[PDB]
Amino acid sequence: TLDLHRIQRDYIDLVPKHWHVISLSLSDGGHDLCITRLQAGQAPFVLRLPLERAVFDFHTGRAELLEIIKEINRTCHDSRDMAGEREKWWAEREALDQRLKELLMNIEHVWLGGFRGVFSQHGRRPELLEKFRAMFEGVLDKHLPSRKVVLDGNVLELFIGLGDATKSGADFDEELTDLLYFVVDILQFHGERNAYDEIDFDSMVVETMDALMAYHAEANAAPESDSHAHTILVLDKQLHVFPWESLPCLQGLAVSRIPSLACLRKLLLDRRRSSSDPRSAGHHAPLSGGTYILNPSSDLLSTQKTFESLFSTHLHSPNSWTRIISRPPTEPEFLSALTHSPILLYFGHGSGAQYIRSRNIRHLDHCRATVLLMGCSSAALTAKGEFEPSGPVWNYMLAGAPAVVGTLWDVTDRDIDRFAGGVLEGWGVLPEGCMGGRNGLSLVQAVAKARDRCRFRYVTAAAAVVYGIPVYVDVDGK
């Protein structure tokens, strides 16, 4: 607890207040998901969730995920082989899409359950919270025996984070039950004893839900301006393989990853300010002077067709971009692009590691480039799904790249191009309407929205992840 506060002072209090940091790790046993929520100017929140509290433990979840991934990977690489047979290939992938969707639903429902609100990006409102506290403590007085121990606000925020309780058809009964057990356990832990069977949980759910409706009614009447809130995940070595960002509760929200708090801190202090406001919190990369590497191995003819004219028209011609098309970049060219281009686009097979050595990405004085690796398994997870210090992405992060977009497993060209085109429009690298005015989402926000563009949200889009901090395109900057 002493150690954690040193972390708050020396790392978290430097993180923009509209951002919060969540670390995910496992207990030594593997039985518990450990969740820490960190935000500048906020008390740290530490959560320890036993996965089996209610046939589906972590080993089982991870095993199912890796098998699905194995089969997905198998489908990309058959693609060509199947010559009639075309119908069967598609049927196989849609079915895997359905399997992965189901797995993520089960993870959110079973593992997180009523604790999903820990991932909530809602704005904290002390005045409304004090009302909820009063009503909820009232609930406690009315329905418990031992009818003294007071709950931290962060615990109450879990209730708030379940979502808008005033939504037509909203049903929080299991979640609320789950959280009430938590409260009884905390009280119990702090010297207020209570037998489970002597509590009318079913009445408490009803009164608490009404209390949440009261909160959100007030919250809805007076909503705060758009925060441009971002979540940054710190993941244990074996948890990178999980597409956390594609869980129902994080779907569409701006979420990136960072290898460590040390990384995070370095990147924040390296931020470039806009040439010219929550947007000023991100790193700003000029549109001018980027590099794109398009179809380096020459066989991605469909991909080249998709982007060549657009990149010529919108990037190379007016914005002084370096163009590399249907030829491999030499390693010095690649390194030079990383040093000098604010944005590097890689549209090729894999991570591009066939074109640039890992050990040479470390020799770089500074990686200026924000790097998009649009290729198979470009996050370079291990066969066992682990994030290792030797992959390209880790190296970019160590060199100081502000962000890196990559994939957790293998993907088809057509569907990843859909995603990529989405990122570029939303990020403001390309004009609105290109794939069918210039937008300006953060890179993290643009990635989250662009998942919508894929035919398969899970088989393709769930693979897409971003390591780093929010990056904004600075159109007139230099």
Binding site: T75, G375, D410, D413, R414
Partner: peptide
Amino acid sequence: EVGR
């Protein structure tokens, strides 16, 4: 589609 082609596997990238």
